[PDB]
Amino acid sequence: SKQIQALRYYSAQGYSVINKYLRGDDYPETQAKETLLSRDYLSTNEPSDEEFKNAMSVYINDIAEGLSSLPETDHRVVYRGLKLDKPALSDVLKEYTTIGNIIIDKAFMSTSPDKAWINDTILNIYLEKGHKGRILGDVAHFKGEAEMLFPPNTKLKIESIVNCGSQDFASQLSKLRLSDDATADTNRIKRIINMRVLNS
Numbered sequence: 001s002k003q004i005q006a007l008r009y010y011s012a013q014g015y016s017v018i019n020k021y022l023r024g025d026d027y028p029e030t031q032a033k034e035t036l037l038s039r040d041y042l043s044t045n046e047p048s049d050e051e052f053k054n055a056m057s058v059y060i061n062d063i064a065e066g067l068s069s070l071p072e073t074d075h076r077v078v079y080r081g082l083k084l085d086k087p088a089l090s091d092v093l094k095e096y097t098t099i100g101n102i103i104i105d106k107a108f109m110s111t112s113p114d115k116a117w118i119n120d121t122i123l124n125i126y127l128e129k130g131h132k133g134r135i136l137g138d139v140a141h142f143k144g145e146a147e148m149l150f151p152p153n154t155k156l157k158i159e160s161i162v163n164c165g166s167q168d169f170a171s172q173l174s175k176l177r178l179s180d181d182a183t184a185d186t187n188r189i190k191r192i193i194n195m196r197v198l199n200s
């Protein structure tokens, strides 16, 4: 389907424009327009803001529909590594480290069912039956590491935050499967955040 093809492109390269665009961050505007022209969402090479915005919507919607069309799986937890201790993210860090808080992730959300990629923040994300996440499998561009992707606007409850340097943290970390790639170092981990996707 054209929608699965759009999701393949998202995976390969489109995520680099679309997630910033959906978060409201500065994004590469010329690159977005070229992608829309290239994939025929735009015919004018000088779209109005309206035409551009509408075209981006169809393109994002195509990616989400392709995602939605993939088979569901029985996964009940997934993992995501984030770098949250950058100064420019101090607000985002506050949101994610407020116990009980409810966060709406505006971009597509990339997670792994298999392992957490080590970063200052490890997200331990519990899922309830019927959630919108989908295993990409061979739709993914680079394969051989599993990926469960979620469409825009996933709602996450912050259940508990576990800072480094305690037995609790040590135990919880030991129960995660962590990436053991060329630069893996668990001593870089500042926190675990236990979260839950709120469906519906």
Ligand SMILES: NC(=O)C1=CN([C@@H]2O[C@H](COP(=O)(O)OP(=O)(O)OC[C@H]3O[C@@H](n4cnc5c(N)ncnc54)[C@H](O)[C@@H]3O)[C@@H](O)[C@H]2O)C=CC1
Residues within 6 Å of the ligand: 015, 019, 023, 079, 080, 081, 082, 083, 084, 089, 092, 105, 107, 108, 109, 110, 111, 112, 116, 117, 146, 147, 148
């Ligand atoms: N992060 C992960 O654990 C997973 C990533 N991957 C792969 O990694 C590659 C990159 O994906 P991601 O790292 O997921 O990129 P992303 O665009 O989803 O992550 C954004 C990064 O931007 C920053 N950021 C700014 N605003 C944010 C916000 N409001 N919420 C969360 N983070 C915010 C954070 O520092 C974060 O580390 C992709 O090719 C994907 O296939 C695969 C599985 C899991």
